[PDB]
Amino acid sequence: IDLGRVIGELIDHRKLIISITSVFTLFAILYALLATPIYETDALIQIEQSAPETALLQSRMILGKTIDDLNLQIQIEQKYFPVIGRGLARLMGEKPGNIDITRLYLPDSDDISNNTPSIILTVKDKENYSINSDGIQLNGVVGTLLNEKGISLLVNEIDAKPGDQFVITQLPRLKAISDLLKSFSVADLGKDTGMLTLTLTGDNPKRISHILDSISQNYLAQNIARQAAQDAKSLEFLNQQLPKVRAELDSAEDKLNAYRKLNMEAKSVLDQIVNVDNQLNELTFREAEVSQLYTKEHPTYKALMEKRQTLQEEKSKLNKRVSSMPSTQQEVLRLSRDVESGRAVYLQLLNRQQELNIAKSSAIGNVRIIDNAVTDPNPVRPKKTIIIVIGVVLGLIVSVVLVLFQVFLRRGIESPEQLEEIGINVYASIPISEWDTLLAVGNPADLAVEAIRGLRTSLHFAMMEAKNNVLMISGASPSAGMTFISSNLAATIAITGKKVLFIDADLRKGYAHKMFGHKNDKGLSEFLSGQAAAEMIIDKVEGGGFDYIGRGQIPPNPAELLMHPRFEQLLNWASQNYDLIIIDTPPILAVTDAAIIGRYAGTCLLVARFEKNTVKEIDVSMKRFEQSGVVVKGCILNGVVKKASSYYRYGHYHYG
Amino acid sequence: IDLGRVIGELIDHRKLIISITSVFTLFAILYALLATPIYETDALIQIEQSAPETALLQSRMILGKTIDDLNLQIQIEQKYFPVIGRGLARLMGEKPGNIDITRLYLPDSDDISNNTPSIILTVKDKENYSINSDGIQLNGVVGTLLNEKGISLLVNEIDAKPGDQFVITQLPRLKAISDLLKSFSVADLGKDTGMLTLTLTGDNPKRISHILDSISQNYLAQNIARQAAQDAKSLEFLNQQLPRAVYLQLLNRQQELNIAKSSAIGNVRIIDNAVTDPNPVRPKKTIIIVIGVVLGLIVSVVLVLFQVFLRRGIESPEQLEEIGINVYASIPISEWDTLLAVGNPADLAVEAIRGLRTSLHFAMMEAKNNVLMISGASPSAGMTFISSNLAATIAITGKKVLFIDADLRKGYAHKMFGHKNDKGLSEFLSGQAAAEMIIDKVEGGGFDYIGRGQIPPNPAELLMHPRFEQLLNWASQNYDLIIIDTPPILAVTDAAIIGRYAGTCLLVARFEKNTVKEIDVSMKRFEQSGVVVKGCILNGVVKKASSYYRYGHYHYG
Ligand SMILES: Nc1ncnc2c1ncn2[C@@H]1O[C@H](COP(=O)(O)OP(=O)(O)O)[C@@H](O)[C@H]1O
Ligand SMILES: Nc1ncnc2c1ncn2[C@@H]1O[C@H](COP(=O)(O)OP(=O)(O)O)[C@@H](O)[C@H]1O
Ligand SMILES: [Mg+2]
Ligand SMILES: [Mg+2]
């Protein structure tokens, strides 16, 4: 191949190329403009090693401590119904809403799969709101806590417009730890120094900085505990307190065994209290530790008793509910409470004993925060430019390969050279006429009619020394242009003052009578079957100037009629009253009518359609005519259009 | 391919090559002369390690301290409307202005995007100025501080000419830290030495040196505070432990801790305070210009090679003669509504046409009659030009010539000869005229002609009338030569109808427009209609250095 071919093919398929590339680039643009941006924050820590510190920072202990501090197990998502509502809302300048939640406890359905309970909160105003878990509508108010139907909720400072909806999920603690750990990274950045670089990525530019600050504070507090833990009495306090609790736990277990040897509400309110007790105990430890390493007027410490206030209020409401259930199940719950309270505290103290050991045996005495966490205002993802470039390049690659397949899979004719290589004379090339009437009469100045005049002058020289004045037009496949060519050629030969007869011998799908204006009675069939004479079948074209014979009524045995000798009698009679006779026939590959007629025709031409037919089809038609004893003079290419890749140039342009 | 061909192609396209390369080089010059210069300053620090000190130097605490000290959060820009105003103003040697601002507070609009409040200050004199936020015009004066509409401002020492405008931005502290960081670099250069090279690049040759000095001072004063502290912690502990030999022992230890606190010089030492290299490091003008010139050359050469491989027109008669087509002449462009063979009888094109005339005088013997038909493949190839001038030159030799304009669709011969447009060829063929009212005399010629007449609606069908052959037979007895001009053969079929009665037929191929394919198709289409084409005439030739086919198209006399 050569570059001229490929350039021509590209120019010809430019519309497809442009469409595909535009679609791919549009998809890339929309993706890069709708993807939620991802911000990144960092901090710098000074270590007085650093590999065990790297391992310890990403441990479940410290991250879990941070989550318990910041209530990261409460997931809040602004609701947009489509997969693109969020992006457009950001683009429209709409301010994303947020709600501050300080207490959430769902009834914890805890089925086989959905371990994460979730509810939907709809904003009604700046004060009240609606809540639905499974369609059950409840109304709540900012400020006052809600304790209904095994659902505990505390909403503060709703910042949104009315009508907004938010999904509230209570995801499990380990899930929150895993989510935090996925997006959190630690590095040394020097491979030897006491410098640690902490990095965190997330979609909220403020939340991630707060989280990273909390992580740094927790780690520093853990190491600063080391220096003060050796002389601390908490070690001896825990060493003595733990055996006492275990006996209480064991005694609680033993009592529970004696009473044993399932009310839904009673079980739920039991879970209500146990959750409250857990938060109260851990907060009590947290308040102690914060009071030691921080001050009371610190906002963190101010947060502590406020949450402690809420927990006591929730417990008070729970006990009032417990006061309302019958004592029969109350005894079971009180036994159930103590066992779980014992287990929870025993678990809590075991960590406390473990954590206190963690402080003491720490080789790195001094840990310093050089740079507190800040967030880079430029999002790190998505990287818009690379996405757009990849989209454009992908569009170009797929367009080019698609064009190469379409080029390599075409087999139709493209230029008369393909036919002339085989040894077939092409007598004309007719272009597509963009214009049920004769073209050679409606628009005599059309390009196609000019090409047909060229064909007329070719024939006037070819059809000399022919055995008679009968010309047959046929073709390989239907809808190639046989009737079009034949009728228009008849018109153009008629306008020069010669008597022309057009015979529509397509006894299967002929419609020439429609295109000429007709008296459909007494066509060719009626003559061939013997029930008409030769004079009632000939009609005059109105806008033409030549006579015609229509097919007539469709017979059931077309090919058998054409073999009757009356057909040759008709041709011999007509050949003395007309200067030219043009016969239209069905395709030769489909049926055999053309080969029957061709015995009586002095000249025979095939019509090959430009892009549809193949060289093989035309060769096969040539040979099939040969076998039946019909000599084909040549071919006529029809329906040509301008192709830049052709590099073969017709005169199909207006001159006048 | 060979070297001669490519050299010729470059010689021929030299105009395009020079134009493209010069444009690229001009843009390179403009960029290298208008880009804002960037200066670079450096300093050298000695470390008494060196891996964590790099990270501590680029920390937000030290850079933030520097920014707070030198107020890097007040950004001042001289205003030039275009992306080239600053560069041009520098080129005329105009001194940029500067303003000292020591206190600034904007209302902090802080919308979703524009977190950076800004104002525009227009200097009116050495003392007063106008301030606009969003059209809110205020007047301020150097010295007195301003607090109006939630804007606090203090300007000192305006150094500019009146009428200048300055954009004043109060960017957030973190943005200033990031901006400082991106232009600040630290390297070790020894991988073990206590040597650190600090580098800072910026547009102001003095401001960057001040900033780097401030950074070094902050880092150094921070470092000694670390060593002094651990001594100070030890000194504080000993003082707090004071309750007589032990009493003197602690006092002596206290003095040792006092002297160790004051003798601060420690791990960090400033070898070289920052200085600025006066030659800007960017833009690197020479490499920019070299890249521009090379890019121009490469794109020009690729464009020329592209055009060469996509060229398809005829270039020399050898291309036609390979196929087996006799080329009887080659006519060049005549750079000179009149017959060329009369206006400028000594033109080069008329010389080539005389060569064609002598070729014909030998080709047209043994022709069945004395009729010559000139046709072509595509329109505006030169058929009318060639036919008319050939008639003129053959007429000046004393032979009777008849010129027929059988282009019944767009023939304009009557215009070019001076006309009585009535009774053309159409009127004769349709039967509404006789053979004698149609023949007209050319004034500056010497031959008769027949114009087309009125454009008919059925040109090709008229030409089939036997009256046309009657006219030719009659005229062939009263003239020595008959020339017939015809429409192209690819467009319409008129030429192939006419060619039945012509003894000789020639094609005209236009030099670069037509290709060999059209000429071959035209020959074959003439053959199918029973018309034998004698040969071809190449028209419109111009000099190509790449040709290596070389004509007699030069003056001799
Ligand atoms: N060059 C052409 N320009 C415009 N229409 C054409 C051309 N060739 C064929 N056609 C139209 O396409 C249709 C199929 O051609 P037709 O000859 O009637 O069928 P068939 O070849 O099977 O006998 C017809 O409507 C015809 O008018
Ligand atoms: N070698 C030439 N030098 C100068 N002008 C030419 C030359 N060949 C053709 N032309 C001019 O360019 C125009 C196109 O030629 P023309 O013969 O009129 O078209 P056509 O061949 O279709 O009849 C004409 O105006 C002609 O005078
Ligand atoms: Mg048909
Ligand atoms: Mg002309």
Author numbering:
A (entry chain F): 17 to 64, 85 to 297, 304 to 477, 494 to 714
B (entry chain G): 17 to 64, 85 to 279, 385 to 477, 494 to 714
Quote the authors verbatim.
Here, we report the characterisation of the structures WzcK540M2YE (Y718E, Y717E), WzcK540M3YE (Y718E, Y717E and Y715E) and WzcK540M3YE_N711Y (an additional N711Y mutation) corresponding to different phosphorylation states. One intermediate, 2pY which has Y713 at the active site, does not follow the YxY pattern, since position 711 is asparagine. We show that it is binding of the i-2 tyrosine to the tyrosine pocket (where i is the number of the residue positioned at the kinase active site) orders the tail between the tyrosine at the active site and helix α23. A mutant of 2pY (Wzc3YE_N711Y) stabilises the C-terminal tail was functional in vivo, restoring immunoreactive CPS to levels approximating the wild type. This is consistent with a model in which the more stable the Wzc octamer the higher the Wzy activity. We note the reduction of CPS production by destabilising D28A and K701A mutants further support this model. The Wzc3YE_N711Y shows greater phosphorylation relative to Wzc3YE and proteomic analysis of purified WzcYF_713Y/N711Y reveals both N711Y and Y713 are phosphorylated. We propose that the YxY pattern serves as a molecular ratchet, that by selecting a tyrosine over phosphotyrosine, ensures phosphorylations in unidirectional (moving from the C to the N).
